[PDB]
């Protein structure tokens, strides 16, 4: 809850990468948990955690698109603190997304 320091890891499987869920360790977190990751004073990025056995305790993995978007890198030290959504105001009613050909 208060936040813990950690180092990012690599996504183990393509299926987890597609789901856009940070792959974490069962001993550390649980499926459906929601966190905020700090990389610097002005860099806080929100994520949702999903547990997989392959993740070592004290480590969390992100997909390549996640690393590109949030600027995360393997080997760097970051912080992760559990954050809870306020569904009364933060519920999604209509989300508009830009879609592009991933491969030309």
């Amino acid at each position: 809850m208060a936040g813990r320091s950690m180092q990012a890891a690599r996504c183990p499987t393509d299926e987890l990468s597609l789901s856009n869920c940070a792959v974490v360790s069962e001993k550390d977190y649980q499926s459906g948990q929601h966190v905020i990751v700090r990389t610097s004073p002005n860099h806080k990025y929100i994520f949702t955690l999903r547990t997989h056995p392959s993740v070592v305790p004290g480590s969390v993995a992100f997909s390549l698109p996640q690393r590109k978007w949030a600027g995360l890198s393997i080997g760097q030290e970051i912080e992760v603190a559990l954050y809870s959504f306020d569904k009364a105001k933060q519920c999604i009613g209509t989300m508009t997304i830009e879609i592009d050909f991933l491969q030309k």
Partner: protein, 276 residues
Amino acid sequence: GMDTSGKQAEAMALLAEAERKVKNSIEEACEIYARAANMFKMAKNWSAAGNAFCQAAQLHLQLQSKHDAATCFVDAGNAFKKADPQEAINCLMRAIEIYTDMGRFTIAAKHHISIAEIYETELVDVEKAIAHYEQSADYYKGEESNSSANKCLLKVAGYAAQLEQYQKAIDIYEQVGTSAMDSPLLKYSAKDYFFKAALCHFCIDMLNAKLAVQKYEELFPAFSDSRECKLMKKLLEAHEEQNVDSYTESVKEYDSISRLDQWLTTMLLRIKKTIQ
């Protein structure tokens, strides 16, 4: 010919004379031993000359003398260098210990570099050579010898990248670049060092190399204008494109523009192998 037999007989006679003189029980014995070792040296009998030098060294050390004993040990080790690297290493280590006790850091560091060179040249052992180079570099840095420490650290980093992990290479190259870039004369070559680190980052992953090159560009504006960063960016584009043909084309274009060190070629071959 006359030289061989005559010098050998004279040296044997001198050895017997010294043995009898010591048997009577002393400086004259040490002088006779040194002369006999010299005659052996002229006779080209490198083997057993170091033994006579060591015997003289012990004979003189018996009476508390340490300086001339250290010099004799160093000379005996140098003589053993060609005859036997092991005995030469032992004698040089003894001399280094004596001088370090006496506090002569320059001589000790030079002897350590000689030990590393003999270890890496004749025998096959780099880790001991790496440790010797590190010891010499620390000794020189204590005596604020910037160039010698930088050279030793650069060689250690090159060896580490060659066989050991890339962390040592990154650290040492970054340190040397920091030390040299601020200096006026060496700044011209500073860029070079930085580039190496970036390449060593490409060995682990492309993202780490990209971040490292961005950090280098931000720290060093001229690094942006260098052709080397342009080549690295083109190589990065090729790798993200999974196109070995572009990699080969860029490498050959660079080779035509300028010749290679044969180490950059090995690193680039390793990088291109893992493109898959």
